[PDB]
Amino acid sequence: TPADLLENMSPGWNLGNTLDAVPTEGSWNNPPVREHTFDDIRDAGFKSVRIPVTWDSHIGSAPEYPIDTDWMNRVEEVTDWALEREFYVVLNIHHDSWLWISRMGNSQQETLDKLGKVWKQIAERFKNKSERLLFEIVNEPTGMSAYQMNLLNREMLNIIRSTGGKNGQRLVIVGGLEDNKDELLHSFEPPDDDRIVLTYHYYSPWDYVSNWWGRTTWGSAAEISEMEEDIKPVYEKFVREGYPVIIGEYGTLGANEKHSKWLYHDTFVRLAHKYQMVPMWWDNGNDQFDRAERQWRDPVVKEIVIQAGRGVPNAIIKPADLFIKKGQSISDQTVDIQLNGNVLTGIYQKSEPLKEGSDYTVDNAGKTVSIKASCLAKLLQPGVKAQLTFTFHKGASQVMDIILYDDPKLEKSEFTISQSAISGDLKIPASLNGTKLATVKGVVDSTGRPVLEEVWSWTPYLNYDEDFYEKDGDLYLKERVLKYLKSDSTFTFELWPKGVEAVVKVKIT
């Protein structure tokens, strides 16, 4: 049942940008995966792992398309490591989707024949593995009609089932075009098979999860309702008619603001759990778990996923970052808690409890905390001076950073660039003094229009990572942005806390 799949697999995590890298494992930002990484993911409490695999460069010539023996052995080695740790494991065909499977539209007979020969080999090799191994037919398929998609699912499923044995009953994961929710609802037709699982990916709102166009925060009543409105119809059409469902990918993709990130993950994973959908977290190796340091970049959001993935609601504090300016008058500070049914059990500085009464008070409802000013003053150069851990009877703890900040200071605020010597990003050395980068906008000085008008006409706000970023306290404008510059322009780096900014002028010769 869908309930069974949820109990057994929720929550999951993706081994992203690894076996799916191009041309081979280790070609991108992760080295080839080490066995102990699976021990670390198990320590975290994930019940399942998705192992995206890109087969492309390891597939031999027509007509038999033999998969390189060393590659097949490697994929089995990693898959076995995961299975030995009692994970439910999803094995797929990944970036092949746009590398060659998208030739389906223009050359179906040849492409479908090739994919069939590939799936037959994968199915044969993994035929005798535990039922904890699931096959996913193809990641985010594109370049074909909805009819072709349905045909592809049917034909590949038939190939897997025809190998017999344990593959006769193995769960197989199928979706619509682009693993898209709307396609699943409207153009997808379930194969006639009672051992399939449906899938879609979820990354909405795209501009929030990616921090595009200044969308730095998430969590309005409208946004929460829209998220449930995206998910509920898949439950109504499919889950309550008995189809298990896996959300093969979800998560933030560069969004950094802490409260919103925590709220987004708690809300989504709780909705997934509510509607009996298995949520599998996307992590490209730089997003969440640091495999080299063997620690999570944001431990709190991980604990939120682990608890919400088990149907345990998490309490959410606001603010998550408490900004106090150097020199400012220190008053009692209010912390609101969205309890989500939980009860606050204490507030700690590491292992040392704060004293209720003198350090802080709580209202009768237990959801509004006042941190007394003398306590704050004791807790406090700019930077993180303290971390307060809010513990709850159930669910993840919330950690609030106490940050002393001051006005950000730029060594240089005006830069000259020529249109013919542009090569690499523009570095803007800064002393951010405890502040954090939120977003950036760029305006052409003479016209008042967006610097990137040629691509995004409606806004001057830029996109995280592809246009701007912060690194080691310095600010950067990407080469992409510089190439669109025609005359003198002004960039406004908006920081946390809100209202703090740094203005940089760029002169064009």
Token pair 């709780």 is found at 270
* Cα 323 → chain centroid: 26
Token pair 């389906």 is found at 104
* Strand ranges for 127-232 from DSSP E: 133-136, 172-175, 196-202
Statement to judge: residues 400 and 416 lie in one domain: no
Which of 282, 313, 344 is the endpoint of a domain? 313
Look at the alpha carbons of 177, 182, 184, 185 in this order and tell me if their dihedral is positive or negative: negative
Statement to judge: residues 397 and 320 lie in one domain: yes
Cβ atoms 266, 316 nearer than 8 A: yes
Q: How many domains does the chain have?
A: 3
Kindly report whether the peptide bond that precedes residue 63 is cis, defined as omega within 30 degrees of 0: yes
Token pair 């595009």 is found at 212
Statement to judge: residues 450 and 425 lie in one domain: yes
Bridge partner list, 134: 90
Radius of gyration (C-alpha) of the chain in whole angstroms: 25
Question: What single-letter DSSP state applies at residue 318?
Answer: E
Cβ atoms 15, 33 nearer than 8 A: yes
Point out the residues that are catalytic: 140, 249
How far is residue 93's CA from residue 22's CA, in Å, rounded to a whole number? 13
Statement to judge: residues 320 and 309 lie in one domain: no
Bridge partner list, 415: 506
Helix (H), strand (E) at residue 397: none
Statement to judge: residues 191 and 108 lie in one domain: yes
Tokens of 348: 């700690």
Which of 313, 337, 365 is the endpoint of a domain? 313
Which of 269, 291, 313 is the endpoint of a domain? 313
Helix (H), strand (E) at residue 91: strand 88-92
Counting Cα atoms < 13 Å in the Cβ hemisphere of 293 gives 9
Cβ atoms 108, 145 nearer than 8 A: no
> Which residues span the domain enclosing 393?
314-406
Statement to judge: residues 103 and 178 lie in one domain: yes
Statement to judge: residues 215 and 246 lie in one domain: yes
- Residue 91: closest CA among 19, 149, 24, 146: 19
3-state secondary structure at position 495? strand
Statement to judge: residues 499 and 389 lie in one domain: no
Statement to judge: residues 281 and 339 lie in one domain: no
Statement to judge: residues 371 and 481 lie in one domain: no
Tokens of 141: 């398929």
CATH number for the domain spanning 38: value is: 3.20.20.80
Question: What single-letter DSSP state applies at residue 329?
Answer: P
How far is residue 206's CA from residue 90's CA, in Å, rounded to a whole number? 25
Statement to judge: residues 200 and 132 lie in one domain: yes
Query: Residue 141: CB partners within 8 Å, gap ≥ 6?
Result: 97, 101, 102, 149, 152, 175, 177, 178, 179
Statement to judge: residues 303 and 367 lie in one domain: no
